[PDB]
Design a binder for this molecule. Structure first.
Ligand SMILES: *[C@@H](c1ccc2[nH]nc(-c3cc(OC)c(OC)c(OC)c3)c2c1)[C@@H](C#N)C(=O)NC(C)(C)CO
Length: 300
């Protein structure tokens, strides 16, 4: 059709990946700035990702697609910009962040994942850096799940999209099996998010200089300190939830739905409103956080 540069003015970068790139751009006609993802078709096929952005991008807590282009070589995905930075980091930098707000945030994030899983979609990369605030309003309504570059639609053999209910069609078990994992895998990530918000540090990582082996060793042990120091002033209700989200066995791990039925999310009005006793090392956590997912994606 037309072309991207004809309607957008490219600005500075936001995040440069091996396959894709994200830069800030401004819709010339309206002067309204956005974020544009440039994917190298020759290196990766962005179909899957866009298809998901087109269908479920309408969700309030899912980064919305505003326009698309394709000059043959690359594909420009014009999405909404996030003027609120990383959700986790921002929260970690709130010294008085209560325990009630955690339930609020996690709920909004969870409510979104439940929908995705319900539609047969798994993020497969639901790390903290991919959960930003659209603005600085603070209210959970401004939460956005982004970067679906690793998302995956549950489908059949004949390119037919499927849902976790309708199984009357041909869906290979090994394909359905991994979906059951990726689902609980997304949950696991949310468990990490929660754990970090409550205490102010990663459950399996200490900093950016943690060997992938020791990190995996920790994750592999299944056990993780849910008490002492920063956990002292945390609700047992909250601690109960975390232990079930980070449950080593994915089969015995809570599902998005089950998490939403949990009392810490249901009876939120009975949660504390006073500040939490956390560690104030947002940057350190950022490294430890990246140090983890890196160890997991070492075979990707
Ligand atoms: C690039 C991307 C795409 C759309 C975006 N909308 N807002 C932002 C954004 C992210 C930030 O990082 C936390 C940030 O803070 C500096 C700001 O500025 C306030 C805006 C977007 C970023 C990703 C996507 N999709 C991306 O690069 N993904 C990979 C790394 C290529 C993997 O898919």
């Amino acid at each position: 059709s037309i072309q991207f540069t004809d309607g957008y003015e490219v600005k500075e970068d936001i995040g440069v990946g091996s396959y894709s790139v994200c830069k800030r751009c401004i819709h010339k006609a309206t002067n309204m700035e956005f974020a544009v993802k440039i994917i190298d078709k020759s290196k990766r096929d962005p179909t899957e990702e866009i298809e998901i952005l087109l269908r479920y991008g309408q969700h309030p807590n899912i980064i919305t697609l505003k326009d698309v282009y394709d000059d043959g070589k690359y594909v420009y995905v014009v999405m909404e910009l996030m003027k609120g930075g990383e959700l986790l980091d921002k929260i970690l930098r709130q010294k008085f962040f209560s325990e009630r707000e955690a339930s609020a945030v996690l709920f909004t994030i969870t409510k979104t994942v439940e929908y995705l899983h319900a539609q047969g979609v798994v993020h497969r990369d639901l790390k903290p850096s991919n959960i930003l605030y659209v603005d600085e309003s603070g209210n959970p309504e401004s939460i956005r799940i982004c970067d679906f570059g690793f998302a995956k639609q549950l489908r059949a053999e004949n390119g037919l999209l499927m849902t976790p209910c309708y199984t009357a069609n041909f869906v290979a078990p090994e394909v359905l099996e991994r979906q059951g994992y990726d689902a609980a895998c997304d949950i696991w990530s949310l468990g990490v998010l929660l754990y970090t918000m409550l205490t102010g540090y990663t459950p399996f990582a200490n900093g950016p200089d943690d060997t992938p082996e020791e990190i995996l060793a920790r994750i592999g042990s299944g056990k993780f300190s849910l008490s002492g120091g920063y956990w002292n002033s945390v609700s047992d209700t909250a601690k109960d939830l975390v232990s079930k989200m980070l449950h080593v066995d994915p089969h015995q791990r809570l599902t998005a739905a089950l998490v939403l039925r949990h009392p810490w999310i249901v009876h939120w009005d009975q949660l504390p409103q006073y500040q939490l006793n956390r560690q104030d090392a947002p940057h350190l956590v950022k490294g430890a956080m990246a140090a983890t997912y890196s160890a997991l994606n070492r075979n990707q």
